[PDB]
Amino acid sequence: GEFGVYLVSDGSSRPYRCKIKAPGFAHLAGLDKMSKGHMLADVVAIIGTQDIVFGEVDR
Amino acid sequence: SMMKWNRERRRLQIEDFEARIALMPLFQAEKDRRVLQMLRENLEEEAIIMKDVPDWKVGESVFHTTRWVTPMMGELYGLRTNEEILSATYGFIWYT
Amino acid sequence: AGRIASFLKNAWAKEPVLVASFAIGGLAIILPSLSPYTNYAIRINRATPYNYPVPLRDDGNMPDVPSHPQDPQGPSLEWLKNL
Amino acid sequence: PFFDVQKRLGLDLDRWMTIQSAEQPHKIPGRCHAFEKEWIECAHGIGGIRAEKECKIEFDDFVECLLRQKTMKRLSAIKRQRDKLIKEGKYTPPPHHLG
Amino acid sequence: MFMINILSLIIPILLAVAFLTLVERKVLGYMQLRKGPNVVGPYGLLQPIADALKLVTKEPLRPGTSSISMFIIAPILGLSLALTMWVPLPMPYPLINMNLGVLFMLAMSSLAVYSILWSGWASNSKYALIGALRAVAQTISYEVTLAIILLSVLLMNGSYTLSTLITTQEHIWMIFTSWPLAMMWFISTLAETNRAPFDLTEGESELVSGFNVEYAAGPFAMFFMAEYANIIMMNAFTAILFLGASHDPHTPELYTINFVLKTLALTITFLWIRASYPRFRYDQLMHLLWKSFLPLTLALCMWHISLPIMTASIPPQS
Amino acid sequence: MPLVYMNIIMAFAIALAGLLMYRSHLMSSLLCLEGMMLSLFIMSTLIILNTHFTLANMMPIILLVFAACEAALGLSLLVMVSNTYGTDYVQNLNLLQC
Amino acid sequence: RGEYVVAKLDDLVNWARRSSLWPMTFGLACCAVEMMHMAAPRYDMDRFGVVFRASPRQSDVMIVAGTLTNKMAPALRKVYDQMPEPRYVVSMGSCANGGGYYHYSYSVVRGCDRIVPVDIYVPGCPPTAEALLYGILQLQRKIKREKRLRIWYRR
Amino acid sequence: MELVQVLRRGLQQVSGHGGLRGYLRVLFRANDVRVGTLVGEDKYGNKYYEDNKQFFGRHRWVIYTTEMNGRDTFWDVDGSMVPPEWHRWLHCMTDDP
Amino acid sequence: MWFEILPGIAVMAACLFIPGMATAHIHKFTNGGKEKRVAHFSYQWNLMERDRCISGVNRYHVTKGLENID
Amino acid sequence: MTMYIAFILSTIFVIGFVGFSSKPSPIYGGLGLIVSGGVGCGIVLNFGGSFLGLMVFLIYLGGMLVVFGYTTAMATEMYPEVWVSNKTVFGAFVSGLMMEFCMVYYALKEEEVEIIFKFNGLGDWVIYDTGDSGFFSEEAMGIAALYSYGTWLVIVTGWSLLIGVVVIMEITRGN
Amino acid sequence: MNIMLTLLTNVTLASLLVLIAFWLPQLNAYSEKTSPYECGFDPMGSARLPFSMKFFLVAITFLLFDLEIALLLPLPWASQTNNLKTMLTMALFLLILLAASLAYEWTQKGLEWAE
Amino acid sequence: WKPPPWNDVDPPKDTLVSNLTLNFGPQHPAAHGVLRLVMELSGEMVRKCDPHIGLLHRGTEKLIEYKTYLQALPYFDRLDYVSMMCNEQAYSLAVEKLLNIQPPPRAQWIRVLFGEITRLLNHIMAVTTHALDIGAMTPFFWMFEEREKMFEFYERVSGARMHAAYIRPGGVHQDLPLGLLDDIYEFSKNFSFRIDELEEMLTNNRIWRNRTVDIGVVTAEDALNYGFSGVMLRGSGIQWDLRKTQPYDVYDQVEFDVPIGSRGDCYDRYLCRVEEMRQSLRII
């Protein structure tokens, strides 16, 4: 999806704080809405199409 | 193709059945002699064993009528071995 | 007419299964009456001699029944082997 | 029945099977076809009260045909006395008993 | 010598089942461009032995909340029934020539569901419980089509005697007369035997291991042995039913060649299907059966009951 | 009368007692009810097969297909009770009372 | 003597145990996709005689593959507990080996062996697919050098 | 025609693997029954092969020695006995031995 | 290639091979070369019982015909 | 032994009935009942009722009692009420093993058991009838008359079954 | 003679085959080993609850459907009757009513069971 | 005793139904090993699902405050671990933006080529892994044979299989080895066939469709409001793509057709993804 990194530079040779936009984060956030109106054997299907690789969603 | 094959089988079956029809006379006569001969052996055995019974006159007709009744298998094979009993009652029934 | 042909074709567009089963079941009931072989079927079915044809007491004047299972008298099934 | 519609319109619904001496598939008999036919024709056009006692002979004979109580008791007494005698060694079964 | 013949029937099948794990593993791998077991012995020939005696030497852990008597009876019924499935088969001359073998075949096959229900309840876990409940629910839905298919198929045979199927197919394969039913019967056999897409009973991906989700080591092989034994038997049952073979009385060797060669082809296409189709879903599993299978089976049964009458081609009952 | 006929007849009678002697699971009660008919189905076959009442071979299936129908009613009522009450207990199935 | 007979019996059990293990890869992180990569037709574990089996009551060896956090820690142990004997755990990747790249973070336990008795440590970040295949080969060699029946004989 | 030729190599495979003994040895020891040209031999008994006709990967391969640094290695197999200079060539890091 | 699976299934064909051969040959061997005379109906059964009694040795499979009558 | 084999099958039939009639766990009661269902078929098989014997296996063992397991899986009283759970069920099971053991001994000694009916304890094999059935299996010809003479039963049985499905959905619809 | 003997042999074969699969592996179960497996996490206490109606509804429909098919097993011998026309009409009746029961069950939701 | 209620409707008791909180995963194979998805269910029907995540939460951003920019680069390779270069593409684009330094054009072209090669990496992951759980598992292995080929390409350039650490701020670390473009050209030719294997295997298969079509549909407004991105919006017909609307790097000097769906269900995305494969092949 849209993978963005937001970092704040202190002006030193090191970053201060880096925020990464995880496409899976919003997608896994939206996992509740899709699952409404579907069975568990479709819940597995939605999880597949969400491309929720968890190290990406877990940051 | 099947309707021709099935039609042929029916001709085969009636041919097979017709052989059994011709075989009934000898079979019926043989079973007729066998069953009443074996009953007589029972009656002969009855009149060696019921002599001492206070009230037993041989050949009692349990049915009041004089018409012949097909012999029940009990009085037929009752005085035979265990092999004769087993091979007669359930002999056809078992036959895996 | 126009609706019937459209509805039948349109139904065959969504569901092809029940229209197929309805057609088969529809055939399964009519042609049994229209078939010319059903009378043949019951004739051969009656022709099978499961039981013994017990002989009839011959007292004269029944020419139809044969006196021997080779005489022309009596029922014959020359159709059967051809059928 | 309470309302014998079968008799009125003459369509056979159940009586084809109420007794065993009626028409049977492939014309094969029951165990007691001979006896129950005799009892039935004995107790036709007679009435239940009269047929209870008048056709008693045909009944218990027919009952004995399918129950086979006294016949089985006859065999039991035959067998019971046999083992009550041969165990004492008073009479030995002939070879045809044992084959 | 009836006894030695019995071991001559059950022992080879058990060894056949063991080798079925190897061939399925290799063939399924080959679809996936893999190689399958080829390191353990020549072409993996000893892989079934390796898998068999490794699991036997693994402890049969019983779950804490299990009725041990209930936990053990189910494999006994499952494996014994699967081996009993072959006793009426018309293999040259049928072992148990039961005149109603097909009914005996169906009754025993339908009695297999008790293993599914009992295993799920004895395990006593929600995952196993709903896994078993849907498993039997898938199971009990389809054999009504099995019975209907057989009644229509056997209608032109003559009786329920399995040996009579040989003489019916003496000229042409019986599939040609009822190929709509042949695919009807074939698909229903997968559902009974619980292979993909009808693997929602087990559902390795989404139901972990179905009723075998806990069932481990010692008696787990029993369901596995019973499952795979049914695969051959169902394919063998299909082989005789539709793909009949000529049988010379003076050489039963020849028809065994034809029957055997067909029944591996029928088992091969089983896992061939597994290596191509996605797994079904519970609702589609019922909807497919009750909405597009039952109506078609009814009509075809109606077609096949009246067919001998309209053609005067009723078969002899003998 | 043959000893076996006692075994089915006594099987029914003890099945009849289990149907009437209740406990706390009318599910178990239904088991005695269908066992009750199984003895009826079983015994009926013995006489009919024994006496060669060929046309009477009818009723063992006829009795089966109708006794099986009561299972549909009985089990359906089971879940109905197990929905307004949740369970299949019988002591709680006394809301009528008065 | 009895020593020779028990040696053959031990080897007979030994041969299957080193050729019929069914791993359960507890997929954690980028190390896990590599194990699926050595499921690819390129390496194909199943040619050795091992199958990816879920329901870890069936598996023999279980593979931790990736970082292990405190949130994942207690459940992962329980997977090891009801995993039936004989049970072996193979450390996949640096993160599972000794915390790896996140060895100093607040949320990952340094090394997986702090939770389970690691049998084989496989280095890598990620270990290339055949490097794990090598580790599995080492597992069977170690499995070959056991004296279970022999020890009981002297017990 | 073609099936005969495919059968024809099969006995040629038996001839290539030193008759029956080598064929039985390699198939029970390496599960490989394919023979290629000799490419080299280190000071270990690690006999090496190469066959460009096979696809990338299996085109060059090895069967391991029986004696490795005073260790029995007839049945066991490890990838680490490969010496460094030959480890370069075997992994196709350099296509010249 | 796929000639490596044939060793697996060839053994399979041999496994299913055995039960057919055994039940064929035991039926042949026990019943004096002839197959097991099946009796799906009572007629065929009482046919056999006549043969068993008429053989003079109490086995049905021993068949003995025109050499007897006089 | 094979002398009184049907004596045996009848005996497990009784103890199988005493099993579920003793009100054990509904699955366990099902287990006891199907055991009686299994053994009862053999009794019919020994009498030549193969088709009738096989049906109870099909529609009663693999039929009714399978959906019975669903309600047991649906009921699921909070604890199993297996035989060890209660002591009355043991007493019910223990009791039901006495009187039938008493009267068989009563019937095996003098055979004059007069419980309700007069009953003979003679061997099961006696009451069998001697006579060939030709080529037509008497059981098969009887059932096949369903569509020859059992026309009236077929309509009523079919109509009730059709009404059987209309009621079931209507009661279960829950308004 | 052979029938239950065949049944007898399989049951012993199964029982010993599990018997040497039970005592031989030297059972060494612990408390956590015997603990239920629930996707690797804690079970919250369950498998003792009713499951709505859909599983029950299909079971009853199957049972009713299984009973009608039970009525039509004897068809292969029914075709051998003397009066085919009555048999043809009657067997067709059972099938169309089997259809009608399916037809109603389909139309009034039914096979689309509850969720 | 209480007289019966007048309406005969005796008062319903407490709730006799439950929603059966199920603890799906993490050991569950479908849970990817680390999912604590917990849901509420009325039978098969579900009410609410809680995707309990964090079973992998590492310090990540926390340690980046302590690592220098160069040292922080390998984190992104491990963040969205299946899209190796696409992550460090974002980091390098971000960092060089602050530095006000643009990479040489040669560097840019290598980045986009590997970026779309990485797009092939992930979309193969997304489709095949999904097919694993839906059932059919052979497209998994079929494509994974190809996945090694670009994985091998990763090794030829960076020196590692997955975590290349190739895209550094200011361009790329090293050059492509001589002839590397030739091998990927051979791979590019044959991969169009491999896509056809997927579509032939799955696209028309009924079992695949019925488990996927009209499943998990979401409208455009909710999809955008949910913060979705990439294919998630495109599947619902949303007209948006970062490579087109805001072309970073060389992506402006290249033509490709964005596969916009028209239903928003799972099937539309599956067609969109496989079309993204072909359009990625256009970029190569």
Ligand SMILES: CCCCCCCCCCCCCCCCCC(=O)OC[C@H](COP(=O)([O-])OCC[N+](C)(C)C)OC(=O)CCCCCCCCCCCCCCCCC
């Ligand atoms: C005079 C002529 C008399 C006879 C004429 C009969 C009509 C003409 C012939 C019609 C076709 C044959 C009968 C119907 C068969 C299909 C039934 C059906 O429901 O189909 C649609 C069904 C359902 O399709 P669906 O679900 O997409 O759509 C059905 C309709 N709606 C949407 C309304 C529900 O198809 C399937 O079920 C797909 C297969 C499922 C099982 C998966 C494995 C398949 C393996 C296939 C390969 C192996 C085949 C082996 C064959 C046997 C070998 C021995």
Ligand code: SF4
């Ligand atoms: S060791 Fe390296 S590759 Fe493996 S999980 Fe940790 S960071 Fe990822």
